[model samples]
Target: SQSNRELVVDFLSYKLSQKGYSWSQMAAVKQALREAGDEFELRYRRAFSDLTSQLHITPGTAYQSFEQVVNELFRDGVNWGRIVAFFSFGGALCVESVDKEMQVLVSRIAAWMATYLNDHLEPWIQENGGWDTFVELYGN
Candidate 1:
């Protein structure tokens, strides 16, 4: 099982490399962890950092957006959805709680936000500015 887990992680890293994630992107935050000087780390860091920070929002917001995007694109709700659902259901047991209604509203909002970011914002960011631009803009 341990070997299998390592294999899966390795496979994921390899596949992720194919998509253009490399080490340079991580240089800003994870410099010490650099190993073998693989370009994959840069691309990987760039992709994630660009998606999370360059987009101009808090980490929590970026993560939430990612959750929404993954759900929309993959049609699979990951841990984020499960947690939200669990809390919503748990809170619903209270007679006067608005958790269910709030969850529905949050879901709709997240969907709309995700769609908007994916369709409009992501393309704009990719085309108009990348990690370099993001860094310049933020003075990082």
Candidate 2:
């Protein structure tokens, strides 16, 4: 996309759209969401180890490893910060993939993030009132 992080925005937006969020609702929070990856590492350092430990992708490894890490990360439940960290984690891996000349994995990782979001986190987010709640919680 526009940047490695832009892939995050597009993927998240596409998933949210599938959930029936309007383009306006999505647009309003776009700026705050842009900070997701950076804020995950800086504003939420406690989340770093969780993401980093699970991010090791090789040309060969069990496909289930990532899902296990994702499952472990959300064992306590879902919240916006974890979601932000998930995107940040994926985006960071995308950058590293470029450096390793395995950019092909970028989209795959993003897909995994999207899968975890949709399958594991979507219900919690919807129950908690969705991105509008996110805007209110951290929009300041």
Candidate 3:
């Protein structure tokens, strides 16, 4: 697990640097983790690693193309767990980017989730005691 954490952090650092982002953004990400509490930080990091692994192993898609992976994630039965991982990954990336475009990118992802939930996930969410259940289980 320590190895995996290092791998994910190193890979994400490289990827962010390659994109011309500043270290300050990464620091912001670290700060976010700190503020989110240790349990959340660990879970978030694990989710990030899982998403990165998915983007890497899945065929015919660019490694950094979040949209493609997202599309694939919803291609079959919607996996709420995968959706949570995707959002966690996107949140980290957004927090670790200096580019204004990254903000817009995250907004687009949020829009997609909103629409998807309204059109699809809402039924399951409601059946499971509505969004409150999700918040209660997953936290705010």
Candidate 4:
């Protein structure tokens, strides 16, 4: 479990720095973890980090890479664990942007994630007993 978490955090940290996010912006990600609760903060960080890393190596611009990663996540079955990572990744991205005063980027990223969730993740998550069940199973 710790290994999975580290895999994600390591990946995310690398991607964030590579993308030119300032240290303060990246620190915002760490700060946001406080809201995720102690048990989930680390878990979310790892998952989001891992997902971000995967997207970083994708063959496209940042936005295109994110889209591809989202597509791949749902291509087979919706792995709830990865879904948590997905949502957490968006949250951290938003937090980072907001902390940096990048209002436009925050709005854009939020809209992107919202559109995707409404069209895809929401239905699946609902059918699978909703957010409560997901947290009960994976929030730790």
Q: All candidates' lDDT scores?
A: 0.40, 0.70, 0.53, 0.61
Ranking by lDDT: 2, 4, 3, 1
lDDT of 4 by residue, 69-139 (tens): 66776788786656655666666656655665654666677788889889888888789886666444543
Q: Estimate the lDDT of model 3.
A: 0.53
lDDT of 2 by residue, 24-124 (tens): 66565775676555666787677666655655667454245565656766788777877776667666666767877877777888787888778878899
Per-residue alpha-carbon lDDT of candidate 1 for residues 48-99, written as tens digits (9 for 90 to 100): 3444343332324534544553454434422322322322222222211233
TM-score of each: 0.27, 0.69, 0.44, 0.51
RMSD values for the candidates in order, in angstroms, are: 15.8, 7.6, 14.2, 14.2
Where does candidate 4 have its weakest 10-residue lDDT segment? 53-62
Model 3: ten consecutive residues of lowest lDDT: 55-64
Q: Estimate the overall C-alpha local distance difference test score of candidate 4.
A: 0.61
Clashes of 3: 0
Off by over 4 Å in 3: 1-41, 44-64, 71-80, 96-102, 137-140
* C-alpha positional error of residue 115 in candidate 4 after TM-score superposition, expressed in Å: 1.4
User: What is the TM-score of candidate 1?
Assistant: 0.27
Cα error, residue 120 of model 3, in Å, equals: 2.5
| Candidate 2 clash pair list | none
Clashes of each: 12, 0, 0, 1
